[PDB]
Design an enzyme around this catalytic site. Sequence first.
Site, PDB file in Angstrom:
ATOM      1  N   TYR A   1      44.785  28.022  38.746  1.00 51.28           N
ATOM      2  CA  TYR A   1      45.798  28.505  37.814  1.00 51.28           C
ATOM      3  C   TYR A   1      45.452  28.138  36.377  1.00 51.28           C
ATOM      4  O   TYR A   1      45.417  29.005  35.507  1.00 51.28           O
ATOM      5  CB  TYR A   1      47.179  27.967  38.192  1.00 51.28           C
ATOM      6  CG  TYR A   1      47.710  28.596  39.457  1.00 51.28           C
ATOM      7  CD1 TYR A   1      48.062  29.936  39.492  1.00 51.28           C
ATOM      8  CD2 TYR A   1      47.847  27.855  40.620  1.00 51.28           C
ATOM      9  CE1 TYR A   1      48.538  30.518  40.646  1.00 51.28           C
ATOM     10  CE2 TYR A   1      48.322  28.430  41.778  1.00 51.28           C
ATOM     11  CZ  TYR A   1      48.664  29.762  41.788  1.00 51.28           C
ATOM     12  OH  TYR A   1      49.137  30.336  42.944  1.00 51.28           O
TER      13      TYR A   1
ATOM     14  N   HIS B   1      48.228  39.531  41.875  1.00 54.44           N
ATOM     15  CA  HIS B   1      49.591  39.730  41.380  1.00 54.44           C
ATOM     16  C   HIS B   1      49.596  40.361  39.990  1.00 54.44           C
ATOM     17  O   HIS B   1      50.325  39.917  39.106  1.00 54.44           O
ATOM     18  CB  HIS B   1      50.367  38.411  41.347  1.00 54.44           C
ATOM     19  CG  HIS B   1      50.503  37.747  42.681  1.00 54.44           C
ATOM     20  ND1 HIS B   1      51.700  37.679  43.359  1.00 54.44           N
ATOM     21  CD2 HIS B   1      49.594  37.109  43.456  1.00 54.44           C
ATOM     22  CE1 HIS B   1      51.523  37.032  44.496  1.00 54.44           C
ATOM     23  NE2 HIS B   1      50.253  36.677  44.581  1.00 54.44           N
TER      24      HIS B   1
ATOM     25  N   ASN C   1      55.936  32.862  47.125  1.00 50.40           N
ATOM     26  CA  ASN C   1      56.016  34.257  47.534  1.00 50.40           C
ATOM     27  C   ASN C   1      57.296  34.557  48.298  1.00 50.40           C
ATOM     28  O   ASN C   1      58.127  33.674  48.506  1.00 50.40           O
ATOM     29  CB  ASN C   1      54.809  34.639  48.394  1.00 50.40           C
ATOM     30  CG  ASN C   1      53.525  34.731  47.597  1.00 50.40           C
ATOM     31  OD1 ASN C   1      53.545  34.883  46.377  1.00 50.40           O
ATOM     32  ND2 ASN C   1      52.397  34.645  48.288  1.00 50.40           N
TER      33      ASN C   1
END
Lengths: 507, 507, 507, 507
Positions: B340, B52, B130
């Site tokens: 993350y 992304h 998403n």
Amino acid sequence: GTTLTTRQGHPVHDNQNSRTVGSRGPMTLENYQFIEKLSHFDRERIPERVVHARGVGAHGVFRATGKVGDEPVSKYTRAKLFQEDGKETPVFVRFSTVGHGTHSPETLRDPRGFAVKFYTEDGNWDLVGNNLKIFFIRDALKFPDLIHSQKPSPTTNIQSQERIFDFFAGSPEATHMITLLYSPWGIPASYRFMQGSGVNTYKWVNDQGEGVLVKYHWEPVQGVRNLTQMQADEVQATNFNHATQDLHDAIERGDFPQWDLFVQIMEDGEHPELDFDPLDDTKIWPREQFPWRHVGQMTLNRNPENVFAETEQAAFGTGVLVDGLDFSDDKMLQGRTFSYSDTQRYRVGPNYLQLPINAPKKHVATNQRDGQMAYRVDTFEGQDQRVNYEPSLLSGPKEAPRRAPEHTPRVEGNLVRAAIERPNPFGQAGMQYRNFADWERDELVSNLSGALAGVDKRIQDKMLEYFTAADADYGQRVREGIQAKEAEMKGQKQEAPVYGTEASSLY
Amino acid sequence: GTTLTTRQGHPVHDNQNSRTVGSRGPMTLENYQFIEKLSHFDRERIPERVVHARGVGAHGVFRATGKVGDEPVSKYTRAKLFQEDGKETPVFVRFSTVGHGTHSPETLRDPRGFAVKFYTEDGNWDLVGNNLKIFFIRDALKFPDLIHSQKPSPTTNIQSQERIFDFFAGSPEATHMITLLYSPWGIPASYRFMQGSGVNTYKWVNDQGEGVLVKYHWEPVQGVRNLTQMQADEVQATNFNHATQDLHDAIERGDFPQWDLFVQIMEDGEHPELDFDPLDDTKIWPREQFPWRHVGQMTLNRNPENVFAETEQAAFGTGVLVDGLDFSDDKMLQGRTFSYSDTQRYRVGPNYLQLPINAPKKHVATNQRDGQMAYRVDTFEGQDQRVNYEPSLLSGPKEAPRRAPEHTPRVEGNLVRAAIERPNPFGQAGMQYRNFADWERDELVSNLSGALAGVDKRIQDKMLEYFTAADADYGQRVREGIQAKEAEMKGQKQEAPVYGTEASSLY
Amino acid sequence: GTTLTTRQGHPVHDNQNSRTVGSRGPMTLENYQFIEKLSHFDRERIPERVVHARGVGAHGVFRATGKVGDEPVSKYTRAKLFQEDGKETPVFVRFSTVGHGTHSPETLRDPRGFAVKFYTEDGNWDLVGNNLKIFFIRDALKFPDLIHSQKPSPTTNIQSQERIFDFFAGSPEATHMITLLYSPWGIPASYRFMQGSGVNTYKWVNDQGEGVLVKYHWEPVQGVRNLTQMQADEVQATNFNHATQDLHDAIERGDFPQWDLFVQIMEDGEHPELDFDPLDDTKIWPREQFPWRHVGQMTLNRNPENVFAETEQAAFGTGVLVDGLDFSDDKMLQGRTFSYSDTQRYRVGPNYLQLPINAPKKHVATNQRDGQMAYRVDTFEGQDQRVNYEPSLLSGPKEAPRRAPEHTPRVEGNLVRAAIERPNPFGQAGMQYRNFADWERDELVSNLSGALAGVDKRIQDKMLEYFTAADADYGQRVREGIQAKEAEMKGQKQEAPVYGTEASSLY
Amino acid sequence: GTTLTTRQGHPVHDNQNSRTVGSRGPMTLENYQFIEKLSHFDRERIPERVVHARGVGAHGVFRATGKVGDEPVSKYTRAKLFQEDGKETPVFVRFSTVGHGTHSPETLRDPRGFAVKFYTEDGNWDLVGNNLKIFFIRDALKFPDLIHSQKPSPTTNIQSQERIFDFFAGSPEATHMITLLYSPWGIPASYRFMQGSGVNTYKWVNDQGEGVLVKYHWEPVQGVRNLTQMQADEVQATNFNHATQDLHDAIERGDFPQWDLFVQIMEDGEHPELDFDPLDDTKIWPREQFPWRHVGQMTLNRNPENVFAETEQAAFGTGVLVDGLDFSDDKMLQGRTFSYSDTQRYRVGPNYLQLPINAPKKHVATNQRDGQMAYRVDTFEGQDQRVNYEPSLLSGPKEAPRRAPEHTPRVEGNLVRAAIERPNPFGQAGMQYRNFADWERDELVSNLSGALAGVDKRIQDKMLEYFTAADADYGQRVREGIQAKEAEMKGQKQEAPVYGTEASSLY
Ligand SMILES: [Cl-]
Ligand SMILES: [Cl-]
Ligand SMILES: [Cl-]
Ligand SMILES: [Cl-]
Ligand SMILES: [Cl-]
Ligand SMILES: [Cl-]
Ligand SMILES: [Cl-]
Ligand SMILES: [Cl-]
Ligand SMILES: [Cl-]
Ligand SMILES: [Cl-]
Ligand SMILES: [Cl-]
Ligand SMILES: [Cl-]
């Protein structure tokens, strides 16, 4: 108000137990509290300074007299922080050693760091100097060579006097530095009872654009105290943070340290009437020929609330000059300017000048953008945000109009790689040896003798050659000291040192 | 106020010329202005997101209804941002692609990122989802394998459909995802006309500590528009930033995009009455069995003043949950949580949660200290600064008292490495194929045929096996499409493509 | 041999499932296989190059003729790689754009990168040049200003022609570059059909220590092809990697691209007989006055086996010169030298020169130590490891004896910040406009007209002033083009572009 | 061969002088030799380990006996390195302290690091343990709290006993550790005369997939020697590297240190017959109930040729296990596993496992790609380079077939945040107090008395409560020691320590 939270702002209910399947079961990945807490902990350490790792910081103020010596300061420089009498300028100072890393004993033999950051109205000014008025080398190209020999060996992780004087054997210009370093002056008792100096030669620029060569000096009001090797070993026995503790506790009890700023002014030029180059940082300027001129006084009166955020992240650079100050052709100085900005981007961060301790205390408008951990953008209020360049007919910051002529000194010569024509590596070294007190010379001879004992004879002869060149008594006393200590070494028993009391397993 | 300065605060008089020996001579190291300016410029770029990378951000607000569906929200969750009707919560949203890097065309086939950061009173909440309701894989261990096949080849730096379906040939669970991705739904027309979903299964915790399985959905008020391959190629011809431009310009003219937040609530448990696992993120929950329940509405109404400082440095994590929200045993979800926090320390920085865009909009008191580019310390006013640990009898932050029971679900099983017992990789894939409109199926068959043409036959047979398993017409139409396109490929001339007009040297 | 392992060497038995409590239960921290795999994946991305991010690399060889033009090469330079006829030197070349980041379309208008790394016996030589013979600016201080205006806006993340010419409006020296850039020459068809040049002025040093000014040129054997804006838009529709694909596929099929190396030699000096400064990189040297002299030919015949490890990690620096080569007082060139090493330590790594692609193919003996990811130590066989400094009486590497006099040009002048005395920013720009072909001028006027249409008139007037100064017809044609295009814009309606086909939710 | 070069391979002719305009003029940017040399020097330092910063490394070998105790080793584990008698496995060991940073005195009170890396045929095995058999805490969530109190204060940069016991006052589980730590066992005389242990509970898996709980122990052949506080102060006076020097010099003269590996095997289960949890790392396993079983012997016989490249870059992780070894539900152990990989990517580098010291001595085939300073790609000979994923029908590495059943223990319980049901923080602490020798108890009471003197009484009362709970005499002796030492302090005067000999300025 006092509730423990995560850095996401989540109130922590259990700071004791991890989330597991059962009270004695395995941890799951459903542990953000654990993750974030440890994720940040694992990256607390930034790389230490490649030199001057061990240090301590303090906030303070600098007061100007409005004059240099007994004549107006405007005569030689147009630096705004000096122009007004009683003009106070906020400063941050970091004292440090040189050789070893963080949490290393402050009783070790080393030059001492004395960096002062002036938050002036013309921006910041970093005066990055040491306690001693001189340095080991005269060319910045030799710096990583000097430090490698000074620092712990890549094979033992321990400092070696043989490695140290191995480099000195091929570097006669370090003779004057050694004379000071292995004297009691190589170990200051504390930072409060210590001198300071910019070491390198700088320049002052006035209203006319005229430049003069300049030396900086910090004279402690508390006086000067040095620590002998015998005294240093005694302190180190129970305290390897004595200098950091000394400065912090003094400010804590209200005993604020003070230094007077002195300057040595010299007419710009080659000065062929001297046996030394005024741009050689291994040389001092004799007071009888170039008297010290008072400029102001600095007082340190506040301790950092957080050592890391302020002292550790503090960044000083010799290129950080305000209007009225300038460089000289000191090959050592110009070499330094490159490394400071270079090493600080890596150590402190790409945006290290955006940090509170490093940021100036005034307006900043640049076209510099981004970089990791960018906390703010250098735009002004009402600016067209899409303009980050100059020149621009649309918006963006504009150049500053010149209110005084720029300093444009004449430079002539061939593009060469050559040493200065007046090295004179033994002259001032001998002078300092003779001008020493008796107890200072005794310590010098004792330290050099103990250090050069057992060292390769090729090194010894070269060092003895340098000492003798400075002074005949100097060379002879060290030679006899070496012979004496090498003889006493030969008549002992060098078995491996045994440590501690014999014990037995508890299980 | 508008005067150009260095980041040291030094007013710049000449932003045009470097300092040199003569107007046409060499540069000297007496150029701090040059050094600092270029030193920061050389480090503007931080590493892009590993996935992304290409994206766009927008500020906004979220309004809660105080209820879930037609019953009180307090029944299922105790999340503070939902409790009051009309309660507004500041949000920052970043839309993105997946496969290629920054400044890559937004007309490419990819899932679309839809990350929302909720600045609640219980801290921050990141909803990292998403556009599509499902994903390629059901285990996070396969993620670097999936991305490597999806991303440009390490030999050509170009995406390869053969490499893509090579991984798909051994991954039948991606069948449902492919059915959506190679349909018109694989290329949303813009971010404003696009759906959103948390994809993974989450949990809601109420006042009683009771937990229920939860799916998140974003329904665009503007409606839904998809971009066909023919339409996508036409846009890409003159615009590779069409989606970024579309969102920015809409907000700029006052046309604020809006999404309604829907939730699917399910009783916690295995649910053996289903042919699919509710913890499988390759599965959707049928609305006829699990209706969508309205929760609130989000409006994006402000563009970033600086793309880098806000959008690029924005960091979202699935573990970033507020009280009332919790994890599920979705193996994909728990796997995400690790990466993350792991990737953001490296990309954005060790202290990335101290950045304005990532920092919560409330009080923060932690014992976390240091880290590179530490801008502030998480102490509270009046705290004993030397206390950075818990527990402590002297000072420091305290635990938060529990105002509601913690969610403690029962977990039983053997520590194994095994797939879920209800894979069913072809079930919903076939359903979606049949439920498609005619023009949607046509695009699906056309894209798959063009992609699988020329690809290794071992891959083709396996993919045809998967498509057929989902639906017989699905498999047959793709097979005929492949045979047709492979036949047409055989009857051309594959010479190297010639570009541009022939020219001649100007010199 | 083909068994999947961890980087710890652990054979992987299950690369499909994570370790969980039950087949559908939560993940435990007992997952090192998962941890290591994702931990490395989360840090795959390094920061892209601040400029020339999008690129492609290729290995090859360079053959010398042993002579420059029709006279021996030893007459002007003593560079070892040129001395013998048929002497082959391994090279690595990276082609690139300038403006946008990685995975950006190669159909965009930009100068094209042409960096060549020579693995010679005297170490490495980097010739960091572009396709065009000149550049936008003549002072490196303006480089971050130039790039910021060229790069996407910090508010829209999209390139803006207004921002571009805003900077050009205050930079008349960029006129000649614009004349080339907005011509068809601003978009090379591919890398194989493209010229190359060092742009800056360099120096060649012979056996006598004599220096001469030098320009480098790469002439493609394949010829030269340019891409019009209309042609570029058609390619961009279906391929944003056409240039990367073109070079790779050509080498793969055996069609090896070749370039002949030409040099322009000029006597060292001010040369007052010119209307331009030979050290101005916005100026070309007329062939009729300074003929091109053949030196050798380069052939690229091997593709990288790994794009990242080789092409992405490749580091080029203008300071990387071998004996026989030297700098000039090109203010642009010396400015570059600083930035390459500065940015590459950050981008590629502190020890980036230890990487296979950047490491020389010969002996290396340095006193440089440590740095992150230090793979080896620059010691020689039998060396005393504790010696990492020079000089040393014990061991360590020694200086090389001079086998030829060093180049020591005379430099006289005042330390100033001033532009060159012969700017002449419109001279060669006008000449190139007239020397253009009709289709080349038409494209130039068309591009400039479309770009300057709608732009602030203050910018327009300044650019029209610059164009007119170069050539009267030049200025008038652009003026008419602007008036025409601003008029057709006035007869439009600027509503938001509508994208894609309307669709409906599937759920 | 011994010629000094740049890292570009350029032979250095002058390593003494920088290139300047004249022998005493300013430096130019025409100094690549200077630039590269200092650029790398400015980035020599990597961040030190957040804990165990000060350390020393040594290479060696481990010999297996083929059996555990008096029964075959295959009975309990299938670890390949243990199976054969006389089987040698290469090892690298790093000894270290805990609290303070690099170059800190090794005479300080601290647990001692004992990390061993096994280069086995099934990959690497890291046994990351300490000298003491237990640790301060039983939950990894408390680790950053523990270290912060142990480390120097963020206000003084000096360790404080008050801060230390402030954390201990709220952590009764650290009582047993304190009993050992403030005993003579808190300062090992040297690394050679020191025990080692994995501290945490591990698991051994055999041919059947059966698992058993396991404790590791290193017994020094040289014996055990401890250092009293009085002895430590005497050593610290002249040597702050005595432990590092001791290990290096011993290996250099051929006196190779040796340790015998012992293991404690326990049947897997809760074991309700114990007053302590076998998964509590603050607990030891009594030899009378769980005898020590001999496994092998380790010999260290080679010093690192480069301290930084090997010892400093060495990375150990508890998750780094080979087949035959496994985790337990030790909440401390699983917590560690996360932090090692997390901190080592940051400290050593993204590709730290590609470094010689960390890389396994066997075959490596992964799909992991890129990362900063990627020196090589984990592909095998003949592999299709474009395949970097699994599964794949084209190429790439394949899974390993299971040659033995995986260990799949049954785990049942609720997802909770709760402490173990058998804390018993004073039990073994009291037993160890009584089992101490007289000189060991005297030192323990003496250290605790001197440390707790002057400390806040709230802390004192809690610690005295903890000591008394372990043993009544324990609490009383410390209480009397505190009363005595607080009384002698009351009869002092706390003026600022005066350092060094008074001196006078030399100028
Ligand atoms: Cl005094
Ligand atoms: Cl900065
Ligand atoms: Cl700027
Ligand atoms: Cl304006
Ligand atoms: Cl619509
Ligand atoms: Cl943070
Ligand atoms: Cl915390
Ligand atoms: Cl209190
Ligand atoms: Cl390097
Ligand atoms: Cl070197
Ligand atoms: Cl790695
Ligand atoms: Cl892998």
